[PDB]
Structure 1
Amino acid sequence: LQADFVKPARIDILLDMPPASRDLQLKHSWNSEDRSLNIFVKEDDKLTFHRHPVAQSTDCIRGKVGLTKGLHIWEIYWPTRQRGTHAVVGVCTADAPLHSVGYQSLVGSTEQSWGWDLGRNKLYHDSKNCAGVTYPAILKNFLVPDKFLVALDMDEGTLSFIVDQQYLGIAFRGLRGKKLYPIVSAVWGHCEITMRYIGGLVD
């Protein structure tokens, strides 16, 4: 019946303000100086990156800005048919590896990153030692669409996602005191992922 579209107060406040300016989006876009060499930021669209079709390779690229406070939201656009076997979206410290040999959910694989595998609907963090957690929590009878929002609350130390205008709930906790960057892990040849910062709330 009626799906719930209620969202936490602060997210409502932020989303009530006008979207961030082009200059602000660019300030928080993919960093061409902090990427896997198998990936490159599109010359004609600094908000989108492209992955060379390298075999047995998992590649990542970080956003230009590391966040330490405030509520921040950004939109990720990842064509569904361009995800392959492992497509993870999340955040990480500046130390997270941007590349690995073979195909896997690199983001969320060590204690340096936190990610949501869009194909497995699972949350990963320190994956080597910790088991993944289903998300969103199943209750009925879930596919992640082409676009959705990521919400990092550094004041509370949480990461959450909003799909189809629906708040999916807190995915990770314990991020307080860190400096986190937006990050993605991909393995599909020629995939293009777009990240557009929506806004930050200093509340």
Structure 2
Amino acid sequence: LSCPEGLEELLSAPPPDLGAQRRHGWNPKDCSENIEVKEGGLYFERRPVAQSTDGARGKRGYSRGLHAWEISWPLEQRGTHAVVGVATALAPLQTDHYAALLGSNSESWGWDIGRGKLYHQSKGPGAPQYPAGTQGEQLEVPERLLVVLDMEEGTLGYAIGGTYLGPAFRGLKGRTLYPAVSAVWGQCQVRIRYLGERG
């Protein structure tokens, strides 16, 4: 019973076409210098750069209603720190070490899809596990996951295989938040597929 209002409606609507996906996809003008946005926003490729973590934001920031998008991040392309979430327009997108960049500061919120941990203003040790009752060593986030941002309640949560896993972060009302990830893997290809909005 934890779903945002209108999530089933949204996920059952005809999927946004490639045009819509590019409009709400990764921004070539808002990513790390070590990331190349391809296909007009449908995916990015992180260049091979040693001792760097690199982020990207979507083109569109959300302040109201419900928005969802699918991230596709091959399991073998995640490396030591693969973080999926949202950021304000001001979050840093690059740092010179391997780290959970997304969620390391005030401006970002991330789920570590290898460790299972949630980061916001967090360096990483002690961070809580998500979803409830799981732990890294005994879960595996598959290639595709949905990111679900409810800007009426002010929550960010995730869905896997069509199933919402609950609110991960709260307290987001009044912000303007963009899709975001941070990555460390040379030549990783991270795709984003916008699923639409309601509200």
Name the TM-score, length of structure 1 as normaliser: 0.91
Fraction of identical pairs, as percent = 53
Counting matched residue pairs gives 197
Q: Which amino acid aligns with 2:35?
A: I
For the pair 1:118 / 2:113, whether they are aligned, the reply is yes
Measure the CA separation in 1 of the matches of 2:23 and 2:12: 21
Distance in 2 between residues matched to 1:139 and 1:29, nearest whole Å: 30
- Does residue 1:19 correspond to 2:15, yes or no? yes
Deviates more, 1:10-19 or 1:76-85: 10-19
Counterpart check, 1:36 vs 2:40: no
Find the aligned partners of 2:114 and 2:124 in 1 and give their Cα distance: 21
Partner of residue 61 from structure 1, selected from 49, 56, 59:
56
Give me the whole-angstrom Cα distance separating, in 2, the residues matched to 1:52 and 1:25. Answer: 23
Cα RMSD after superposing both structures: 2.0
Note if 1:190 corresponds to 2:191: no
2:166 & 2:63 partners in 1: Cα distance? 21
The CA distance in 1 between the partners of 2:124 and 2:77, in whole Å, is: 29
Mapped contact 1:72–1:151 kept (Cα < 8 A): yes
Measured at CA, do residues 127 and 6 of structure 1 come closer, stay the same or move farther in structure 2, by a change above 3 Å?
Answer: closer
Using the TM superposition, name which of 118-127 and 15-24 deviates more.
15-24
- Counterpart of 1:83 in structure 2 is 78
Report the equivalent of 2:158. 161
Could you tell me how far 1:8 is from its partner in structure 2? 4.8
Q: Aligned in 2, Cα 1:129/1:106: closer, same or farther, shift over 3 Å?
A: closer
Q: Which amino acid aligns with 2:19?
A: D
TM-score by length of 2: 0.93
Runs of 4+ with deviation above 2 angstroms: 5-9, 128-131
The one-letter code sitting in structure 2 at the alignment partner of 1:34 is D
Hey, what's the Cα distance between the residues in 2 that align with 1:128 and 1:122? Answer: 11
Contact 1:148/1:162 (8 A) holds in 2: yes
- Match for residue 100 of structure 2 among 94, 102, 105: 105
Q: What amino acid does structure 2 have at the position aligned with 1:77?
A: S
Distance 1:152 1:130 in 2: 25
> How many Å separate the matches in 2 of 1:161 and 1:102?
27
Deviation at 1:22, TM superposition (A): 2.2
User: Distance between the aligned counterparts of 2:124 and 2:84, measured in 1?
Assistant: 19
Task: State whether residues 67 and 154 of structure 1, in contact with CA within 8 Å, keep that contact through their aligned partners in structure 2.
Answer: yes
8 Å CA contact retained: 2:82, 2:100: yes
Q: Aligned with 1:15: secondary structure?
A: helix
Query: Which stretches in structure 1 are left out of the alignment for 5+ residues?
Result: none
Are the counterparts in 1 of residues 22 and 40 from structure 2 also a CA contact under 8 Å? no
Unaligned 5+ residue runs, structure 2?
Answer: none
Equivalent pair of 1:7/1:166 in contact (CA under 8 Å): no
Alpha-carbon displacement from aligned partner over 1:106-160 (angstroms, at most 9, x marks no partner)? 0000011000000110100001499411001126961100001000001110001
